[PDB]
Ligand binder design. Sequence first.
Ligand code: NA
Lengths: 453, 456
Amino acid sequence: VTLAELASDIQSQVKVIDTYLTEHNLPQPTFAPDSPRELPLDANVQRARLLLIEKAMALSNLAIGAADNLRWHCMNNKFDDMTLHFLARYNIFDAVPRDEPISYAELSKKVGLAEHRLRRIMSMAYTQHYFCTPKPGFVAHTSNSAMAIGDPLALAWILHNIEEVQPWYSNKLVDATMKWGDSIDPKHTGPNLNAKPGEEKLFYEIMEEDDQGEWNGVKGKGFRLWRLYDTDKFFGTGGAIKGTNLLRAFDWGGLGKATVVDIGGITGHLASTVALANPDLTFIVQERNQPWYEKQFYEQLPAELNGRVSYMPHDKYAEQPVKGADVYFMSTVLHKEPDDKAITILRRCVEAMDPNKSRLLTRDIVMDGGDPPAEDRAINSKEGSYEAGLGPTGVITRLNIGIDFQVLAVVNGFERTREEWVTLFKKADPRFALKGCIQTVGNCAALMEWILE
Amino acid sequence: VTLAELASDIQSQVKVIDTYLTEHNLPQPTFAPDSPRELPLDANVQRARLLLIEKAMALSNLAIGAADNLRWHCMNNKFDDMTLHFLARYNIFDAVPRDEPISYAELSKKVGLAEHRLRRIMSMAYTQHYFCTPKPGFVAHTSNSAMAIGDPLALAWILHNIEEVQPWYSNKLVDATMKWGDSIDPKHTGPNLNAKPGEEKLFYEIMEEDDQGEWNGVKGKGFRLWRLYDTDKFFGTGGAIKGTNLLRAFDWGGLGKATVVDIGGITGHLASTVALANPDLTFIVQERNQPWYEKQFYEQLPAELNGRVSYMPHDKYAEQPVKGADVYFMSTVLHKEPDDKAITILRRCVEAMDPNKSRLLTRDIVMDGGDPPAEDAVINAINSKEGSYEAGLGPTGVITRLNIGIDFQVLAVVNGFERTREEWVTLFKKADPRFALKGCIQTVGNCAALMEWILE
Ligand code: NA
């Protein structure tokens, strides 16, 4: 592929998006804070967006060239993360007004970072389109930075990765691999490289036990786990894996008056998203209890739900106490479970299921891709062997791998192909059949519907 | 700016590059291993390339959108580094043949990484155009990965950043800032957050003292410093800051038979690059000695030089023992020196200089940009300028990005900093009021300028 071919590909994809926008009289994405945060969910628009991203990234890579790529990457990449670190820890997103500029001097005063160093940090942020400088000596927001204003969930994501995942786990993965090999034991992770036998610590033990700190309403014990729950919420409130995409991936309204048991449902935020849009559904959120859990669960719970979403403490490996529910639902649970543990959970579900009335729904990455929702005969040419966003340089592929590495790093988890999912479920119970595997375009996760035939 | 406007700007820049390659019958860059590793040095080509990178990065960013940029960035960015970590530590660049594919099973066996985990690691590499999979179950190189084959300097750069700068310094910089503020003390860095007073460890102390390891022919004491010297050579052998760019930024041949004193010259590799191209030049490489230094200095030295490049142990802060040399030269020395220490070094140079015969040459980042070489105007057509910045500079310029990356690298390890042209002039004039900036030459595509100083 050449620079000219990439450019031409880019032109075609932009034309599809630009046409849609203008046809529907929709505002154009820009770097201004008032810009739309995403493009339309129309499947053709999203396919063009995903291809556009991939091509643009290839074009920048090709123009940098082989001599400079490795050289520049190991120089700069780490500093984009560091810049974020500063931005979060000094609360700079909130300190810059959303719609007015602020001088470096007054920004400095507000956040307590000396003006010289502040200037340096901001300068790196600008090159990734986080903030901009509209006039000498002044800072203003961009669309990318403005979305973090007033959002602790965004800061949670920044900090969890930079202060936990990367120094404790991903920086150490090579060493962990050389020590324990290709293991699926969650104890064979970075923090235990020099631990004595029996003194190993699990990621989720560290999260729920550490008491030296505070986060967003939770002080002391488990503040890191609470921040982790905020990260989970961050991926449900916007973007690629947002909760409202669940509504297009399964006919929740067709269940009528029904109960959904949400196994490993975190703080029930995803359950609430489905229940708010589907007034006839009742949700039982099953999760491991914590000293602050019930307090935060009911503070978050929308009163509009009128109690249709409730919390039931539960061990996902134990007998399932709700029998014959319409739906047993697990969102991004099983990709942290090796086959034997996944089978245990699945068999607990099977025992409680009525085979002629219960479904088991899972939301997880399907590494080779799910099917588009029904609502969505190709007209303009498809590329290569893969759907848009997938393939070895696809941007959804990239997201899939990033999540694969995220669970590999903290618990030695892994993502699975569709074939691997069907094989695992059939090992849990031979009656299991995959009825639907729906991946909305732009999403990395599929909603899989399983029944026992 | 909109996606259509970025797409239109991209077309304009690609047209410049594409037309030049066709009209000069030059091979196109591709991701194949046989691709050219860079574009031509022609200034118009490099200006279009730098703009092209900037516009394409803006386009991918805008198309990802505000909702997904930060979500995806904090997920994926760290794993591009971790991918390289695995590739370097398992020696995978050398294990994949340059021009043939290799199966995952065979590669797994060659490097001792289980096939299931190997496939995962390689899959992330592919997304950044490091390696590719030409057929199911097989791995092959790309241009980006093939440049590291047989090159320990490339692996030195990966491992120095991922196993030292990032975990010891960059990830702790917020904490260092909260403890010591905007300090210029090299002791006020990540490793010393809990150090007792007087027991702080300097970066260069750790580099030269640690003896628990080995790198590329140096075992034991100073292996990390040896690896750091390999990374310095890595930036001289190719790409933006390569040593041969020095040859176009100053008239070295115009010096005639002359001596250049290379203060803080690492292992003399940059001195050798200029000496090879200029047979009448003698270089004295002045550097702090190490137990392995002289052995490695002479092993590496090209015999073609016939001894014109020599090593003289020297403390850059001490009196300059070579008097009246034609050139006193410092390449990327002063950006690790706060004003007071830089002034000490410069005044040592002054005392040794003959004001009517000696020059002081420095190569360093000029944050707001130097001037193009003489030849550019000669080789060049009627260009018009738009906007406030030369191509590559400005708040989203990719040379600006580079400049800042280096600024942060020295901030992290020694609390160093890069300077503007005005700040360089002010600094030199404080060292000695006679100092005058004669030339400040930045080749297009380079982030560093070669500055010529004289005492008037
Ligand atoms: Na549970």
